[PDB]
Structures are given as C-alpha cells and as structure tokens.
Amino acid sequence: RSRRVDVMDVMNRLILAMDLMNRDDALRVTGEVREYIDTVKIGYPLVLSEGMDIIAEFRKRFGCRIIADFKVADIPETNEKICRATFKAGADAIIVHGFPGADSVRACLNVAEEMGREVFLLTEMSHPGAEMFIQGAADEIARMGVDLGVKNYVGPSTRPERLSRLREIIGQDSFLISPGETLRFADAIIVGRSIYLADNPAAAAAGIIESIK
Template sequence: MNVKNQIILALDVEEKNKAYEILDQTTEYLDTIKIGYPITLALGPSIITSIKEEYDVKIIADFKVADIDATNEKIVKTTLNYGADAIIVHGFTGDDSVLACKNMAEKLDKEIFLLTEMSHPGADKFLKPVSLDIAQMGVDLGIKNYVAPATKIDRLKKIREVVGKDSFIISPGVGFQGGNAKDTLQYSNAAIVGRSIYNASNPKKALEEIIESIKV
C-alpha cells in the first residue's frame, strides 16, 4: 500500500459534516485515511462506503480485531465488504485468530495490518513485553503490513528489525501524543496523525506544516 506524502489521517470524529469538512481540506495532500470506532459507531459502517464514494481515498479500518478465529473472520468480511481497503488486527490473540483475518482479507483481495505495539503509555505493561514476538509471528505467517508506535522510536526501530525492510509499517501517535513525523519515518513507511489535524482551526494548514516538517 502506497501512501501519498507518507501521512495517514486518523479521522476520529463523530459528525459527518465535520468529517467531510476535514476531508475537503486535506485530500489534496492525502490518499489514505484511518477510520476507527468513533465515527463508525456514531454514523454506522455505511460511512465507509459513503467516504469511498465521495473521495478518492484508501480506507484502513482501525477496529483492532481481537476475538476467536471464527468471529474475526466475520468482522473482517463485513468490514471489508463495506469498502475498507484494509483492517487492523491485534496479534496478541494468537496465530489462529490472525490467520483467520489474513485469509479472509486475501479472499476479498484486501489487506490486514498486524498491530504489534500501541502508542500510549499503558501499552508498556502488557503489549511491550510481547510485541516483538507478535511481529515475528506476523513474519512467520507471511504478513507484510504492520502497526508500530511513533511515540516510542526505540520500539519502532526494533519492530522494523524484526519485520524487515520490505514490510510496510504505519505508525500512530504523531502530533498530539508526542510523536514526530520526520523521526518516525526513519523506520516507518507512513505516520498516522489525528488530533493535530482534525482538531486544528485550519486542518489544511496543519497538514501542510506536518508535510513540510518531513522535508526539512
């Protein structure tokens, strides 16, 4: 998956008008957005279809799928059939649950992203100790796409070492959580930015500044 300007917008708003206003201002520079539970629960999964019809963007569904294999398969199938191009899945549930997601996505000619470690401080207690094992499991299963934190560059670097240079990593936590886009892109293929863009008084300008900071 290629990402324009190496920036993914996390569109974690709950109102359709606001979402569209932000997309109107930013899709000149973006071709990939991440949609999570806030907007999907507020507006229904058809918002994925609507955005795909209105804007020429790729959509990653950030549902952090984490259930038994049979349930995971249903979640992935339903989500991707609404038009999402990829879906994020947790790895701590084990290889059978992850493989169910991978197989269903491939059946639909779509992709999954395997979440190795999260960007918030609380992830250090339970996910950090096993994140490299999760990454290695992904490699063993033939997964090419991963999620790793922009807020913990040392961890991001280690995860890159495990998954290899040819894998595609996207990294949340840039901006409001403290991650820096330029530093992140030393090891990641794309930085995920949410609140620093959608809460800005001028989302377009905020995005332009982030893109410019990468070039400096």
C-alpha cells in the same frame, strides 16, 4: 525510506486519523485535506456513531484509501465475520491485534486474501497501560506476523528505538505505519487531532508535510 513496489503507496507518507464522531465534521475535514492525503484511518468512534455506510461515502466522495482501525481481537470464527463485514463495507485494509494469537490473525488474513484486501498487524501500543502485557509480547507478536506472511504493520512512534527493533524483526521491505526520525523506520505516519482540530485543517496538513520534506 524508498517506496517498495509490492506494498501500498500513501500520498505524502501522511495518514489522517479521522476520529471525529459526527458525519458532517468528518466529511468536511477529510474533503479539505484530500489534496494532501489519500489514505484515511477510520475507527469505531465514527462508524459506531454514523454507520458503516460512511466508509463507502468517504470512498465515493474523496476516493481515498480507507484503513479500518478496528483492532480486531476476537476468536477466529468471529474475526472472519468482522473482516468480511468490514471489507464488504468497502475498507481497503483492517488493523488487527496480535495478542489473541496466530489463528485469530490468520482468520483475518484468510478473508483478506479471498477479498483482495490487506491486513495490518498491530505489534505494540503507545499508552502507559501497554507496559503491563503488550510491551513484553511485542517482539513475539512481530515475529508471529512474519511467520504468518504479514506484510503490513503498526507500531508506536513514541519510542523510535522500538521502531528500529520492529523494523529489524519485520525486515526492510514490509510496510510499517506509526501513530522525522519516525520516517527513518516507518513508511508513513498517522496524525489525527493536530489536523482535524485545527481551524485550517488543510494548513495543518500542509505544515506537517513541509516538515517531511
């Protein structure tokens, strides 16, 4: 897939999922791979452990793009506050759930347009429990995103034919990230433990990127 001008550029199509819960270890690994990766996904395990100030630290130290994987899933008024606080902290983008419906997603889009940031709609998840409710809703949530002007999506890499279906719904231009055949549909992949648990994170990141070639 070629880059679309109107959506974000992720260096080497590789997003680091930084789910270490200790500030020292998180900063060490991220600094090590900065020459390979410019986009870092940070979630609640790190921010609840170390504080939201860690976002600004990642930005001041590494100048990386930060996606807050907060899976926002509240009522509209609350979603607005969560997004505002998160963007105020310096996040470039936030991941939101679609299951709570269109108004809850729109609340996030509103704050993001006010503040000049981005919203990623999470369409589907990879874990077994996702079969119970999320799987059956995934296509409709994706279509809802399209009808909300959403331009950034998250989908699972485990079942590639699901990404093909997703890509059919969202169209060829929207930005899609996913936690080889994956990159025929997604614009970037998300990798955590294979990098941040390796003895040489920079080598792990380099190896993955060589495969992408």
